[PDB]
Amino acid sequence: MNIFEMLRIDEGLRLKIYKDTEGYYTIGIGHLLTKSPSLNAAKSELDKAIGRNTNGVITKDEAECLFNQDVDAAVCGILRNAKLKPVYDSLDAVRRAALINMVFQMGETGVAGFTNSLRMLQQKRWDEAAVNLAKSRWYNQTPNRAKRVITTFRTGTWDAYK
Numbered sequence: 001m002n003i004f005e006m007l008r009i010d011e012g013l014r015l016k017i018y019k020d021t022e023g024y025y026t027i028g029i030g031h032l033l034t035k036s037p038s039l040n041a042a043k044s045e046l047d048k049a050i051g052r053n054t055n056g057v058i059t060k061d062e063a064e065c066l067f068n069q070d071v072d073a074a075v076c077g078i079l080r081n082a083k084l085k086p087v088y089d090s091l092d093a094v095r096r097a098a099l100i101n102m103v104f105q106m107g108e109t110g111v112a113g114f115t116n117s118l119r120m121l122q123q124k125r126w127d128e129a130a131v132n133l134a135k136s137r138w139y140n141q142t143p144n145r146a147k148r149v150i151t152t153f154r155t156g157t158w159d160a161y162k
């Protein structure tokens with residue numbers, strides 16, 4: 001297991017534009033295209049991301065391309081954020097993956113907003129952090145995925161993905 005395999009499990013793989021759990025146009029391995037309700041807007045975002053006139057459909061290799069860029073972007077977002085970087089630096093590799101996962105799903109700004117959870121993570125108070133993380137719109141809206149990510153923070157293992 002690693003961050004790529006973890007997010008591949010959580011996000012799935014679909015080669016045609018679809019709507020994610022929030023109702024937003026997405027493709028590939030959880031690549032958010034736009035929050036706009038316009039399918040044409042989503043298709044334009046797709047063409048720009050891939051660099052060709054698509055039909056709203058991409059190849060698996062293209063999905064993996066976007067995925068690698070997106071994982072990189074999540075790590076970058078963490079490292080450039082004054083709230084997230086110290087926590088990331090403080091974590092072991094498995095828990096780092098959990099934090100990357102959250103940023104991939106909700107974005108840098110959203111995760112940086114979890115101030116009290118972040119503090120508990122930096123304090124290595126894992127059970128307490130797990131309880132606090134579940135008290136969230138995030139957990140309520142995607143409870144199975146959030147449970148896997150939270151278990152990863154709680155235990156420092158990949159047990160939730162094996």
Ligand SMILES: *SC1=NC(C)(C)N(O)C1(C)C
Binds near residue numbers: 061064066
């Ligand atoms: S990244 C990227 N996407 C495709 C599949 C077009 N590629 O060949 C690259 C350059 C690896």
Ligand SMILES: *SC1=NC(C)(C)N(O)C1(C)C
Binds near residue numbers: 072073075076077080
């Ligand atoms: S950090 C970072 N790298 C890219 C260019 C992918 N970004 O958009 C961020 C999130 C600002």
Ligand SMILES: [Cl-]
Binds near residue numbers: 090
């Ligand atoms: Cl430490």
Ligand SMILES: [Cl-]
Binds near residue numbers: 128131132135
């Ligand atoms: Cl709490």
Ligand SMILES: [K+]
Binds near residue numbers: 010012020021029030
């Ligand atoms: K998805």
